[PDB]
């Protein structure tokens, strides 16, 4: 119930939101550090995914922390030090001492504390970021009483951005970390942009006339303590009050009773049966994989062709074995017509298609509006019909400098008469004379016998409706086949036997990647089980079939006798014959419906209050 902060800056009121960020696990076994004069412990703790610095203070002991990789003037390291004058934040290659400390001296003649030793780093060569705060006066006076001030800090390192969250709460506890709930808020964002894998705590050193000896032994340690916690990425539920401050939080991975609140999206759980999940581990990494074909697609040839095909005999090109970069197409002002249905712009870069079909032809403005999937006319019904479930779309622009010359441009023809409706994705080249009446039309251009092909008059002086437009139609097909054309997204590495979110060839999901011995036929890429769930991935980068294991596979029934009534709960596992369970515990009872733990079984027979299954009933008694 500690370390909960605001993951985003979006203001929320009376709405519960589920966030997946790096948060403090509930009731975590954090390490305790003690420093009593009567134990100057300043170790180096690794920086895996975040350090939660919880410290209580009464005499201004903890000053700052050092962040870096090697801490030996070989890699970039960050300084945060708060001396008696200002706040210093620097990012340089500091040569750190073995035991850095800050020395504060005391005089017997006059009651005053003044800092005189600054032993943190040897020298700094190259510096990138430096921050100096406003000057202030700091007491630095020891107190003979108990602890008064509690300071909590959150450190996060994502994409090179350092965000610090802190909140001051006055406490009066002696040694134990105080309970309760607190909300932390951001104060500054530091774009350090360095890699940090370890950190060391820097404390304060006090000297006076009561500590004889040299510099290495004539000193005392102030009474202070601090704790270090890790921020494992887990899903949490946060309650945002009307004032904008979080007053409580719910963990979705602490206990089976806590997971019921996450599923129900409420802070109170009523009596009943709830199925959250099996033994569940929150994902820690995200991986995306795409084919390593570093070849540019031939989009330019289709859109910059010297000669465009006719309306009836429209060219068709197949695009494959390359990465499709649509950012040159959908981000240009030349394309007069760029309407798409189901393509989902700003997402093409993510999804994968079996193949790309490109059709090139020139038509007028009044007929380029007819390339909608549902339309009728002299073009959409006799020349080129698009299906209702057409995947892909049509790109058109204006062309009067090209394909339009003075004296007429009669090099383009279109179908005018036909005996039947054209099928979708069908091109017909028939020069046979159309017949209207019952008279024979065996190759005669007489009455009631007109040529199906009609010439196009592309005069430069025509109206904007009669202008000749260069039209390119992009067709995408989804088939049960390995994808050979996809987006330009990067492909990361591969991990095994871990609950990791995966993004394979445009398919996203959560699961565990494991080796599989199944043999896959070459033209099939995905496999599904009886439950119609994804179970195998071809992984074209390595061409190895990987089994998909769900992170939670078993059935779990949580017997919660309310929230305000009681807190103890009973967990029932349907597919367990009493182990892959949350906890063994005690009072394990095996029923016909499964294995029940956390509940006491009696030989009596009372009324059924909370049904379990197969004649098993449970109730809350003394």
């Amino acid at each position: 119930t500690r370390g909960v902060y605001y993951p985003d800056k979006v203001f929320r009121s009376s709405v519960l939101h589920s966030t997946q960020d790096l948060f403090l696990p509930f009731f975590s076994n954090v390490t305790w550090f003690h420093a009593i004069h009567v134990r100057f412990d300043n170790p180096v703790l690794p920086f895996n995914d975040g350090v939660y610095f919880a410290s209580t203070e009464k005499s201004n002991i903890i000053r700052g922390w050092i962040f870096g990789t090697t801490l030996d003037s070989k890699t970039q390291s960050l300084l945060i030090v708060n001396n008696a004058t200002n706040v210093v934040i620097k990012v340089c290659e500091f040569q750190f001492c073995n035991d850095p400390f800050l020395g504060v001296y005391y005089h017997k003649n006059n009651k005053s504390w003044m800092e005189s030793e600054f032993r943190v780093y040897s020298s700094a060569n190259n510096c990138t970021f430096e921050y100096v705060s406003q000057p202030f006066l700091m007491d630095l006076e020891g107190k003979q009483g108990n602890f008064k001030n509690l300071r909590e800090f959150v450190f996060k390192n994502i994409d090179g951005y350092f965000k610090i969250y802190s909140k001051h709460t006055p406490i009066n506890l002696v040694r134990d970390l105080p309970q309760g709930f607190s909300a932390l808020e951001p104060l500054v964002d530091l774009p350090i942009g360095i890699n940090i894998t370890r950190f060391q705590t820097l404390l304060a050193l006090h000297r006076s006339y009561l500590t004889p000896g040299d510099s290495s032994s004539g000193w005392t340690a102030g009474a202070a303590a601090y704790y270090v916690g890790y921020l494992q990425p887990r899903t949490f539920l946060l309650k945002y009050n009307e004032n904008g401050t979080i007053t409580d939080a719910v963990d979705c991975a602490l206990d089976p009773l806590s997971e019921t609140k996450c599923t129900l999206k409420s802070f109170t759980v009523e009596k009943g049966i709830y199925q959250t999940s099996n033994f569940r581990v929150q994902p820690t990494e995200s991986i995306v994989r795409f084919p390593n074909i570093t070849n540019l697609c031939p989009f330019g040839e289709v859109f910059n062709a010297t000669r465009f095909a006719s309306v009836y005999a429209w060219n068709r090109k197949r695009i494959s074995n390359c990465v499709a970069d649509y950012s040159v197409l959908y981000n240009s002002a030349s394309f007069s017509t760029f309407k798409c249905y189901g393509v989902s712009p700003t997402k093409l870069n993510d999804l994968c298609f079996t193949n790309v079909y490109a059709d090139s032809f020139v038509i007028r403005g009044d007929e380029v509006r007819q390339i909608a999937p549902g339309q009728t006319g002299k073009i959409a019904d006799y020349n080129y019909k698009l299906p209702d479930d057409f995947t892909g779309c049509v790109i058109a622009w204006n062309s009067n400098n090209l394909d339009s010359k003075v004296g007429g441009n009669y090099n383009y023809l279109y179908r005018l008469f036909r005996k039947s409706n054209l099928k979708p994705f069908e091109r017909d080249i028939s020069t046979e004379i159309y017949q209207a009446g019952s008279t024979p039309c065996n190759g005669v251009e007489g009455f009631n016998c007109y040529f199906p092909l009609q010439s196009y008059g592309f005069q430069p002086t025509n109206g904007v409706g009669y202008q000749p437009y260069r039209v390119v139609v992009l067709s995408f097909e989804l088939l049960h086949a390995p994808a050979t054309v996809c987006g330009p997204k990067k492909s990361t590495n591969l991990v095994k036997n871990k609950c990791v979110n995966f993004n394979f060839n445009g398919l996203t999901g959560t699961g565990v990647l494991t080796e599989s011995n199944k043999k896959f036929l070459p033209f099939q890429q995905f496999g599904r089980d009886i439950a119609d769930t994804t179970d195998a991935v071809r992984d074209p980068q390595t061409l190895e079939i990987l089994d998909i294991t769900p992170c939670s596979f078993g059935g779990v029934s949580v017997i919660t006798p309310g929230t305000n009534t009681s807190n103890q709960v009973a967990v029932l596992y349907q597919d367990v014959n009493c182990w892959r369970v949350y906890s063994t515990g005690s009072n394990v009872f095996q029923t016909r419906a499964g294995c029940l733990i956390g509940a006491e079984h009696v030989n009596n027979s009372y009324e059924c209050d909370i049904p379990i299954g197969a004649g098993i009933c449970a109730s809350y008694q003394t």
Partner: antibody
Amino acid sequence: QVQLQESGPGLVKPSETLSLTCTVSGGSVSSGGYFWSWIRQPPGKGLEWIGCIYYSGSTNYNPSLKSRVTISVDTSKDQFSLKLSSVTAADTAVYYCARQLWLRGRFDYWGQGTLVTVSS
Amino acid sequence: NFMLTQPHSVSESPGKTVTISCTGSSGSIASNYVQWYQQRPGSAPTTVIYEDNQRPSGVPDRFSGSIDSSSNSASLTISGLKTEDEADYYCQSYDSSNVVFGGGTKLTVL
């Protein structure tokens, strides 16, 4: 997520230069290839499109507002500003800065509206 | 010289249906997309419809749009009017490197 905050004075004298700066918090201007556009709205009137900018130097302006709109992007400060020349009394409008996910798509995220009152 | 024509004031009692038009004069309405924005007074506009039929996540189901290419008019249908629906509605387009908005529509609760 991301948000947009505007700055600059709420007043401008006639026949002067306007200076309105929109600051992006929680995101990056250069990353993602997201277009940035300024849209103003007079009180009681409809929305009017002024111009749009990319992370590069690409700029397109309204034909009625042509030769008067100067917009630049400062990637170091993660902000972009628009300059208006020869501002008149008819320029009294509520200016909005909005990220554009697509070139021809929605203005997905609208910043809060700054009030500009042009008077002598 | 492509502009969008909208009714200035449309009124309908709550719970019923209403159709809001958006007609283009020169350019075809099927050439470019139509985005509908619902702007409450004293607030920034919010995208209520994009890609001419795709409702973004957050808006109710009643915000449905349709496109008529024969009459060059875009349509916005609202069913079951409520109290918070009293806001300005604008239809957007792209023309050709020049974003063009609508006249403005005052959907009245009545």
